[PDB]
């Protein structure tokens, strides 16, 4: 809010401020560019499917156990097991800044249907393979779907069938370690923790800035008009208006830099969801170290979490070749 | 007006314990929000009056001229209490007693009815609410529609194979440059 | 059908339309800014001379030379941000031209929705327009399938395809098109026992 931040609950400060022109009609215009943009990035990552598929009640995918990441009906929200750990690991009287016109708006897509997209992508990538991302969905047995992925890597499909029991147990054990390991180290969520820190810490400096004198007598507007004559009181006030105002245009400039950077990250995430999920990518290390097989998305506060599944060769022996 | 400490707000009672010499209490922003009455020694608490933002919902001027204002981030049981003369900065107070008021997460809406059926978004509001102009015409507010729900029959032994195909053409637009300028 | 789709509405070309809008609108604010007094005696310059002597006019002209300069500074910073955005978009277009035009791209959902065949570029004011040609499967049917087949006490697998049966006889066909074929050793390969 323009006027209240500069001229707190003052009537003689407001009219003097009007002489400075249309300086802060840009701030309403500039900030709304950021506000509209943030409702677009979320819609460009999760809304790539126009059919809300649902998982069948039976969870027997030839031995594989996906119950770890499927939504849980018992929980009041439709959040999976891993998705619940993320919320507890992210922290969002400090809300007294409302009194200085520093409003905060809510996102268009609230958290509840954000997971609904995630459920749709997870359901449609285990019963229809990847064809559902190119038109009509086609069901394929999951136990035999892995054969196509192994063929793409370079190994013949026979290898999968000989070790179906072995491969399922190894994969099932792998996902179990992810649950505890995520909460083991505190720096895992660092790339998300700083986002809520930066967008909250910067507000504190803006509020704390208006307590400085900026070369005037006092930091409060009321006493100046009640102690000094109107003819020269405009000198001290003008020394203070240009102080707070300049400190405000610094804040908006900082927001533009950060906003221009997040967009460069959301677009990369959009490609990751488009390629590493809806298909198999031949690019190296783009969807995780080692040969790529599949990946699953998971929602998170102000971000997304990917779970890549990769193939890695074990011990070897040396031979002689011609 | 407390010994020249001019200001504006609503005064309540607080449990803060001023020491015998203390008279004024400051905050993070270094402004007065706790004063002791000179005559009767009690610890009052000062907070500024209520406020918020205003947004107007409207279709194009070519369509009907009906509107629906919004009050951001305020309990909706407050501004209807302000139904008097010359108490609010907006002067179009005819809509204070408007249509059926509706309460949302981002404030409350005046001039629309919360229908049950859901369509795709037309005018974003917040917290999964988008208004539109449906049919005898009116402004309505409803809930998000994520697309038609569908289920795929999954079985241990079955597969689908296409028996035909189609060819489609899709367009795409990208900016490449902006107007060169100098000053 | 592309002919009228472009001319069917006006919001189809929104991406290019607001690019020039966001630049002309910035100029208008810059032009109208110089009319602001910045709290001084008068906005126009020469008028502030005849109405005062030549000692306190400096504070009355400093405000008219910093505001006219600080505002110009703000406009320049806006241009830098937008230039840093167009630069990111232009590089994407070059990548699209180098892949979706001069060849066939295997990357999914990069040169149009569905499987990609070819694309054609078209010029545009301050932009480029592509025409992606894509292949999309039509209607399908349910089927019954098995992973492997055991004939001489040994298993066989489809070399390139999947086993399928209409309930009476078994066949092997392509992944993306229905073309049943008779089972054939030259069309399969044997590996290991079928137990
Ligand atoms: C599943 O597909 C197979 C392969 O096409 C079907 O078997 C074939 O069906 C055709 C059409 O009925 C048969 O052609 C005709 O068969 C009669 C039988 O008396 C014959 O007199 C005609 O001269 C003509 O050849 C074909 O023989 C038959 N082949 C075999 C090996 O049975 C089968 O009917 C399909 N099952 C379904 C659709 O349920
Ligand atoms: C998938 O794995 C989970 C995790 O181990 C299994 O759930 C466990 O089931 C055992 C007994 O069946 C319980 O003692 C554990 O408390 C369960 N843990 C959790 C986290 O639910 C689940 O049964 C497995 N599903 C399948 C189909 O194998
Ligand atoms: C696959 O779909 C195409 C598209 O409809 C079918 O082509 C049609 O065939 C009928 C009968 O010959 C014609 O009357 C239509 O004019 C054709 N449509 C077009 C767009 O040319 C084709 O027949 C289908 N494939 C099969 C095997 O039926
Ligand atoms: C035949 O194919 C259809 C798919 O085209 C299978 O799915 C049935 O049809 C629609 C698919 O959306 C559903 O309304 C039905 O409920 C589906 N059937 C069942 C039992 O779920 C169908 O299962 C296939 N049938 C056979 C015998 O293979
Ligand atoms: C208003 O709508 C009518 C009917 O759709 C149309 O004929 C007319 O051109 C429109 N006018 C404007 C200014 O859009
Ligand atoms: C206003 O505050 C009361 C206090 O409990 C609350 O019940 C009510 O929901 C609030 N109004 C809105 C619109 O949230
Ligand atoms: C929506 O449906 C419920 C039925 O549970 C009904 O009580 C309610 O009146 C409906 N709302 C509207 C606006 O018709
Ligand atoms: C697939 O069908 C049911 C699904 O519940 C399963 O129990 C059965 O074992 C499977 N069929 C075969 C042949 O494995």
UniProtKB/Swiss-Prot annotation, chain C:
Q: Which residues are glycosylated?
A: 142, 166
Q: Which domain of life is it from?
A: Viruses
The protein's name is Spike protein S2'
Tell me what effect the entry lists for residue 18 to N.
Answer: In strain: Delta/B.1.617.2, Mu/B.1.621
Residue span of region Heptad repeat 1: 1-38
Q: List the disulfide bonds.
A: 100-111, 150-194
Source organism of this protein record: Severe acute respiratory syndrome coronavirus 2 (2019-nCoV)
Please describe what this protein does.
Subunit of the fusion protein that is processed upon entry into the host cell. Mediates fusion of the virion and cellular membranes by functioning as a class I viral fusion protein. Contains a viral fusion peptide that is unmasked after S2 cleavage. This cleavage can occur at the cell membrane by host TMPRSS2 or during endocytosis by host CSTL. In either case, this triggers an extensive and irreversible conformational change that leads to fusion of the viral envelope with the cellular cytoplasmic membrane, releasing viral genomic RNA into the host cell cytoplasm.
Which residues lie in coiled coils?
A: 17-61
> Effect of altering residue 50 to A?
In strain: Alpha/B.1.1.7
Span within the full-length protein is 933 to 1127 of 1273
């Amino acid at each position: 809010d323009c006027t209240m931040y500069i001229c707190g609950d003052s009537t003689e400060c407001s009219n003097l401020l009007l002489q400075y022109g249309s300086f802060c009609t840009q701030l309403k215009r500039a900030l709304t560019g950021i506000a509209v943009e943030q409702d677009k990035n979320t819609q460009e990552v999760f809304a790539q499917v126009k059919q809300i598929y649902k998982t069948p009640p039976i969870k027997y995918f030839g031995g594989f156990n996906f119950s770890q990441i499927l939504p849980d009906p018992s929980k009041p929200s439709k959040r999976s097991f891993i998705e619940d750990l993320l919320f507890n690991k992210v922290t969002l009287l400090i809300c007294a800044q409302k009194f200085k016109g520093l409003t905060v708006l809510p996102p268009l897509l609230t958290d509840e249907m954000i997971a609904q997209y995630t459920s749709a992508l997870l359901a449609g990538t285990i019963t229809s393979g990847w064809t559902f991302g190119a038109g009509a969905a086609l069901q394929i047995p999951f136990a035999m779907q892995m054969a196509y992925r192994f063929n793409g890597i370079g190994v013949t499909q026979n290898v999968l069938y000989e070790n179906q029991k072995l491969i399922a147990n190894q994969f099932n054990s792998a996902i179990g370690k992810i649950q505890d390991s995520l909460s083991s180290t505190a720096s895992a969520l660092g790339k998300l923790q700083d986002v809520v820190n930066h967008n909250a810490q910067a507000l504190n400096t803006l509020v704390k800035q208006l307590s400085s004198k900026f070369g005037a007598i006092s930091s409060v507007l009321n006493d100046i008009f009640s102690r000094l004559d109107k003819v020269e009181a405009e000198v001290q006030i003008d020394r203070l208006i240009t102080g707070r105002l300049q400190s405000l245009q610094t804040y908006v400039t900082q927001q533009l830099i950060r906003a221009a950077e997040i967009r460069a990250s959301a677009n990369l995430a959009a490609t990751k969801m488009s390629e590493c999920v809806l298909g198999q990518s031949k690019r190296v290390d783009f969807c995780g170290k080692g040969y790529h097989l599949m990946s699953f998305p998971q929602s998170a506060p102000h971000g997304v979490v990917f779970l890549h599944v990769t193939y890695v060769p074990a011990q070897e022996k040396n031979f002689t070749t011609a | 007006n407390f010994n020249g400490l001019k200001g504006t707000g609503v005064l309540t009672e607080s449990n803060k314990k001023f020491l015998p010499f203390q008279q004024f209490g400051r905050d993070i922003a270094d402004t007065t929000d706790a004063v002791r009455d000179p005559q009767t020694l009690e610890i009052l608490d000062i907070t500024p009056c209520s406020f918020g933002g205003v947004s107007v919902i409207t279709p194009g001027t070519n369509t009907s001229n009906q509107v629906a204002v919004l009050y951001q981030g305020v309990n909706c049981t407050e501004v209807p209490v302000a139904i008097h003369a010359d108490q609010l900065t907006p002067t179009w107070r005819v809509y204070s007693t408007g249509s059926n008021v509706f309460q949302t997460r981002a404030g409350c809406l005046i001039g629309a009815e919360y229908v049950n059926n859901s369509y795709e978004c037309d005018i974003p509001i917040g917290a999964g609410i988008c208004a539109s102009y449906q049919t005898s015409q009116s402004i309505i507010a409803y809930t998000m529609s994520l697309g038609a729900e569908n289920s795929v029959a999954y079985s241990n032994n079955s597969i689908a194979i296409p028996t035909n195909f189609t060819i489609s053409v899709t367009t795409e637009i990208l900016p490449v440059s902006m107007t060169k300028t100098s000053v | 059908k592309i002919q009228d789709s472009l001319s069917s509405t006006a919001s189809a070309l929104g991406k290019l339309q607001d690019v020039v809008n966001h630049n002309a609108q910035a100029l208008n604010t810059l032009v109208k800014q110089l009319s602001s007094k910045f709290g001084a005696i008068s906005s126009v310059l020469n008028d502030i001379f005849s109405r005062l002597d030549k000692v306190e006019a400096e504070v009355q002209i400093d405000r008219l030379i910093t505001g006219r300069l600080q505002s110009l500074q703000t406009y320049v910073t806006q241009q830098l941000i937008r230039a840093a955005e167009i630069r990111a978009s232009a590089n994407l277009a070059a990548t699209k031209m180098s892949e979706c035009v001069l060849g066939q791209s295997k990357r999914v959902d990069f040169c149009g929705k569905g499987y990609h065949l070819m694309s054609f570029p078209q010029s545009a004011p301050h932009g480029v327009v592509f025409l992606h040609v894509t292949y999309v499967p039509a209607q399908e049917k349910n089927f019954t399938t098995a992973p492997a087949i055991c004939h001489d006490g040994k298993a066989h697998f489809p070399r390139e395809g999947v086993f399928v049966s209409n309930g009476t006889h078994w066949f092997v066909t392509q992944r993306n098109f229905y073309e049943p074929q008779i089972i054939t050793t030259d069309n399969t390969f044997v590996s290991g026992n079928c137990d």
